[PDB]
Symmetry: C4
Subunit: 96 residues, 4 copies
């Protein structure tokens, strides 16, 4: 369930950097407890966008989990994100 949720989030890509939210280090917490799924995440820029497409795409991915009918996506800026949260793979891909 938690492994499946992680694999599903790896499909959610942040267009600005061209990497998935997981390798970008944007997912802060993930809990799956049918019929609910809970994910706490952040964005690379500290401000709420007019449309949280990324949060929406994360909601859609988790919904496709077995036994999940309720998906809660909490977008927070605590702690504030920095490039340090990238995975090594993400770094190699950005040339950082």
């Amino acid at each position: 369930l938690e492994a499946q949720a992680w694999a599903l989030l790896e499909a959610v890509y942040d267009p600005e950097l061209g990497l998935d939210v997981v390798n970008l280090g944007l997912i802060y917490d993930l809990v799956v407890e049918p019929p609910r799924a809970y994910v706490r995440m952040t964005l690379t820029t500290p401000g709420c966008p007019l449309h949280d497409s990324l949060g929406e795409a994360v909601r859609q991915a988790l919904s496709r989990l077995p036994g999940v009918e309720e998906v809660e996506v909490e977008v927070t800026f605590e702690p504030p994100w920095t490039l340090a949260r990238l995975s090594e793979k993400a770094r190699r891909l950005l040339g950082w």
Copy 2:
């Protein structure tokens, strides 16, 4: 060996129901100081917010009370810094498939 190492091993028995891993590998323990007859630990929870019953904090208090010469355990539950999965141990990641 030292009371510190023992405390660590004891806290590894304290499991967070939600994720199915111990509080130490989950990175929920921020500070641990053992000075008989006292034991102090500052920890956090995976989600921001005080639960109606802090079962996890209570289990932590229980585990530390087993330490030799410890009769009073203080468990401070803070949200600073705010916890994230990045605090998981490499081992914790493996088990979760993350």
Copy 3:
């Protein structure tokens, strides 16, 4: 584009520690989308200096990328910086 930007920033040195901003861990966010370039960074000490030379040098460095006329340099203290953010190569040069 992200890789060239990163490399260009490695040229910006911080007088105080004699190391570049990248190895010092001062760059929190980097996004290149011509004609714009965006960088969120911090300083080693809390507080805005009378003249943010470091911020200015970052502006120039990015003001050289292909198709970039508007560079935004946001200097934040969130999260607050510490020496733990230095790269392995940085602490290697500082004997830390």
Copy 4:
């Protein structure tokens, strides 16, 4: 002399955890430029102690660098410290 600095501090020990403030990850910033010596550090517990020995002790070890007569020790709680800031050595010593 950013090594004279790093060394003198590694001699300052925290009685509570029996380790040096450096390996404990308590030193956030270090800047020495005679006659000035500046260090930003934190404590393991949240709150100012009646007597900040570590702070005092840090000032003393820094008041003996090359030509340093004015040492500044800023004790902050930002970012808030946690055991995750211990060095690998501190860990393989406190059995953590």
